[PDB]
Each structure stands twice: as C-alpha cells, then as structure tokens.
Amino acid sequence: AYKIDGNEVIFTLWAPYQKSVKLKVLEKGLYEMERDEKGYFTITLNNVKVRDRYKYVLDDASEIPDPASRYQPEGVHGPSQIIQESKEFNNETFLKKEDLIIYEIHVGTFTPEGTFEGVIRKLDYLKDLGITAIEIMPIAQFPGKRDWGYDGVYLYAVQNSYGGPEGFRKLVDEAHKKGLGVILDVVYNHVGPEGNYMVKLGPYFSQKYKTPWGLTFNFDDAESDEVRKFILENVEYWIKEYNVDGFRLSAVHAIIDTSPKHILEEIADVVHKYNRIVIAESDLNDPRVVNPKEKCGYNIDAQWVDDFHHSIHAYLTGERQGYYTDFGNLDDIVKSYKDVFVYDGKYSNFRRKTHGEPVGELDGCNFVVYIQNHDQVGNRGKGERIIKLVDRESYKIAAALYLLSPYIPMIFMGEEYGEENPFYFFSDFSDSKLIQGVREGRKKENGQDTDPQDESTFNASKLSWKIDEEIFSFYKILIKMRKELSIACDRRVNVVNGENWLIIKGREYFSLYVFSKSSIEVKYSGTLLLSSNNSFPQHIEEGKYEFDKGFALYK
Ligand SMILES: OC[C@H]1O[C@H](O[C@H]2[C@H](O)[C@@H](O)[C@@H](O[C@H]3[C@H](O)[C@@H](O)[C@@H](O)O[C@@H]3CO)O[C@@H]2CO)[C@H](O)[C@@H](O)[C@@H]1O
C-alpha cells in the first residue's frame, strides 16, 4: 500500500499485468508511477496527509481501490484512505496458551450497536464470566454492513461500519486494560466475490484449484513470491499496527502449497517471531498442522477439532444429516476425549475415504473444542442453536463435557446465558448475480429459507441478551473450576462408559455425565463442586448409585 516516511509517503502497487498505472489522489492530482521489472509500481509523494483518499487508475483507464488499503470509508468500491499509523505494539501477548478460554464474537450481531464500541461495552461482563480471550470474526472490509466476514475483500482494511481502524484499536487497547486478549479470524484461502480488483493486477490467484468460495491464493506458481509476501505482511501488519494477540486462520485445508516450505509454516514463523499465538481451523485431521518443526509440522499453536463437537452434537440430538453421519455413538465422544480425533485414519462414509491420522502425545492445548460456533449454528438452514435441539439437562451436560475437557474451550457468543435466537448466514452484496447466487446456493447447500440478503435475517441473528441466570451461573462455575482443578492441556484422563453414562476422571476431579437414568458404579470419592440439578450428593464415596439424568463434578 503506502509507507509513511517522516513527512513523505511511498505508494506501492504490485501490478505485473499492467503496462502503466497512475496514482489518483482525490482532489489533488494524478501521478505517473515508476515500474520495476518484477512489476511493482512506485511513487514517493510530499503532499499527502492522513485522511487523504486515493485510487489507482489502470491501463484501460479504469479506477480501483488499493488492494492493500488500510481503510475503505465508502466500502469495497470506494476510494482508499491514508490512516493515523500509530505502529505501537507489545513485544509479547500476555496470553498463555494453557489458560486460554476463548469467546467467539460476530461484531455486527453481538450487540444492538453492532460495532467495536458495542464489544467494549461488554468487556467487563466477559471478564467477569472468566473468558481470557475474545475471538473476533473477520473484519477485513466486506460488502455492505451485514456479513459473517468471510466475504472480506481488503485484507488490511478494518470494516467501516464496525467502526473502522479506530474502533478496532480502541477495542484491543480496552481489552488489554481489562486483561483480555484478542484473537483475529483471518482469511488467507480466498477472497470474497464482490469488490476484489486483484485479478486485473497480477496472478494473485491460483489457476491450480478452487475453494467452494472462490479461487484461492497463488502460493507456489509463477510470480507467487509477491503473493506470499502480501499474506505474510498482513500477519505482521495486524500485530504491529493493532497489537493483536493472535489469529484464527480460516480453513487451512484450503491453503494449498507445494513449495519446499509451506506458507502455513511461514505464517506461524511470523506470528512466533512476534511472540503471538495462531490457531488453525483445519478439516485435515492431520497433526502436521500443529506438530513442531522437528516432527515435520508447521508448528501452529492449536487447531479446531470438529470431531469433538460432532461427537457430542450427534449423540445428544440424534442428528445424522451431512457430516453427522460419521458420528452418533457414545463411543465417539469417548474416542475424542481420549485420542482427540475420531477419524484418526479410519474410513469415513461421509467423505468416501480413509480420513485423518493419530495425534500422538501432543498435549490438550494443541486443540480447540466447542459445542457451538458460528458454523455449527449458522450453516444450519434454520440456524438453530443447540439449546433448541436438546433438553436443558443435555445442554448443561454438553457444556460441561467441553469446558472440563483437556482442550482449549471456545464459547459461542450467547451460549453462556442460554441465548435462543438463531444465527443465520447473512450477506449484503449489491451485485445482482451474487444476490441471486447467495439465495440459491444457501437454499441448496444449507436448506436456508430465510433470505441472506434480507435485513430481517441479520436482525433475527442479533443476541437478545436475555439472561437465563441458572445457565449463566453454571457456565461461570465451570470456567472457574476448570482453572482451579488444573484441567487444561492434561490428557491423562480415565474414561468409563456404560450405555447411557460416562465417568471421566482427571488428576484432581471426576465427573458424572448421566444421559439417562442409570445405576452406576462410582470408583472414586469426592466432594461436590457443581451439578446440573440438586439430586447429587454433596459428598460421595465409592459404590453403586442410581442417578437421574444430569451432570456432577467432584473434588
Ligand atoms: O454466496 C456467498 C458465498 O456463500 C457460501 O460461502 C459461505 C459459507 O456458506 C459460510 O459457511 C462461510 O464459510 C466460511 C466459514 O463460516 C468459516 O468458518 C471459514 O473457516 O471458512 C468459510 C469460507 O471462508 O462463508 C462463506 C463465504 O461467504 C458459498 O459457499 C459461496 O460459494 C458463496 O460465494
């Protein structure tokens, strides 16, 4: 994009497809740019200040925003803007992976405001709940106001309608004062379908394959050095310019790289260079994502493990559609509890292939688990939260299973107080083809009948903030007991199961998960820390008990 250099500013556009490019500074001038042989265009200017707006005009005289824009005040087709530029950052995150309890937030819907300011207003509540890091869904500028974020199209530009650069920086600074970390969801596997102008510039995109969401970045073919650079500088930029704590990488199985060093390893190298954390959403069931270099891995800090969610959801709801077909047994939950992946190199009927690989001795803090998140709610056609799909006891049992697991737990916004509103897929394109495409694709892929482009679809997805006190208090105590029992990262657990029950015993605790009234042989003693109802004894000893449906934590 641009580099401020005392009182001058250098503009750089990578555009090998283009014979000649002009810098257009709105209400100032047009300036010819110098071309190097790799196709970078440069010009250094003296008359540019903060708030100045610009575009680049191409060979065919067409005008485009800066692909590396730091701010798009008028959206994805408007001009780019020069910004404030406080390059101020801590050399370390204070976040410790082992203490991580994550809370996923969609900014537009989290709060009536729908902005960063709205999330600042909730920091005290979040802190008090006991979360240690917030995970922000993508903020790279996308079309309109209503989008999950995965249609982001300007990787360095903070969404205008969320409050732009200033709002986000204020959010992170305020989060830090309250002792909360911020994790940014970033998308390096594709670009959204409206408002991306990189195709006219050079081979940003791979000819080699496609994601379900668009063409993917070119990391390993002709001219890919510069595209690797575009992505790697983006990770550096979020750290230095916004003092962000870490990242959640969208769909790393869709980032394909046959280079000698995988771009995923380089991504982690940048984040580790600045002592930050990265988490990968990976559908590979392959420890290489998370293995250290010495074990041939990319050394990413942790990965999402859908198998854990899927085990719990399928078993508790009886659902078997789509990917749930691969799950549904109690055994699947115990397998994920013991071995992390259910598919650790076993035939998948859903995938029609052998899937995954065992994880070895990696500790629990290489993985993140959840009973809810924006996908497991929002990719449902009716967008239902799991609260609508199981009874109250099972909801509490589910919450306990993940929050007391050895893995890093992630809470979906609202889950903790028993939110009941759906979370739908919504979008805000203005290109009529994409408007028709999204409705038709989403109806077909997801069975979504609400219109993604209809504002009511977004309004309906806003949190109500209607507190179920009994559920909220139950979450708070879970989170606190997790910390006090040193549950985190520790995979040394013993698991016994019968038909309709599970007992899980760690170093300092044991839990009873009674799915259905059962006579159970309890091999341990302890004192009761928390229970989902009042039927469990305060002190229990070794013996046989007939329990009603519920959950209890001892010791
Ligand atoms: O018509 C817009 C777009 O819709 C569909 O793509 C969306 C997916 O339906 C939706 O699930 C979401 O997918 C992202 C996940 O939510 C997220 O966790 C991440 O890891 O990766 C996914 C892609 O980034 O968002 C996409 C994009 O909006 C449809 O498949 C597309 O063809 C269509 O372009």
From Swiss-Prot:
One of its GO terms (molecular function) is 4-alpha-D-(1->4)-alpha-D-glucanotrehalose trehalohydrolase activity. The record marks 375 as: Transition state stabilizer. It comes from the Archaea. Changing residue 296 to V: Reduces activity by 50%. No change in substrate specificity. The keyword Cytoplasm applies. It is an enzyme of class 3 (hydrolase). The keyword Secreted does not apply. Substrate binds at residues 248-253, 306-310, 374-379. Coiled coil: none annotated. One of its GO terms (biological process) is trehalose biosynthetic process. Pathway: Glycan biosynthesis; trehalose biosynthesis. The active site is at 250 (nucleophile), 281 (proton donor). Gene3D superfamilies: E-set domains of sugar-utilizing enzymes, Glycosidases, Golgi alpha-mannosidase II, Immunoglobulins. Its EC number is 3.2.1.141. Its main location: cytoplasm. Keywords: Carbohydrate metabolism, Cytoplasm, Glycosidase, Hydrolase. It is found in: Cytoplasm. InterPro entries: Glyco_hydro_13_cat_dom (IPR006047), Glyco_hydro_b (IPR013780), Glycoside_hydrolase_SF (IPR017853), Ig-like_fold (IPR013783), Ig_E-set (IPR014756), Maltooligo_trehalose_arc_C (IPR015156), Trehalose_TreZ (IPR012768), Trehalose_TreZ_E-set_sf (IPR044901). GO terms for cellular component: cytoplasm. CDD domains: AmyAc_GTHase, E_set_MTHase_like_N. Belongs to the glycosyl hydrolase 13 family. Homodimer. This is Malto-oligosyltrehalose trehalohydrolase. It comes from Saccharolobus solfataricus (Sulfolobus solfataricus).
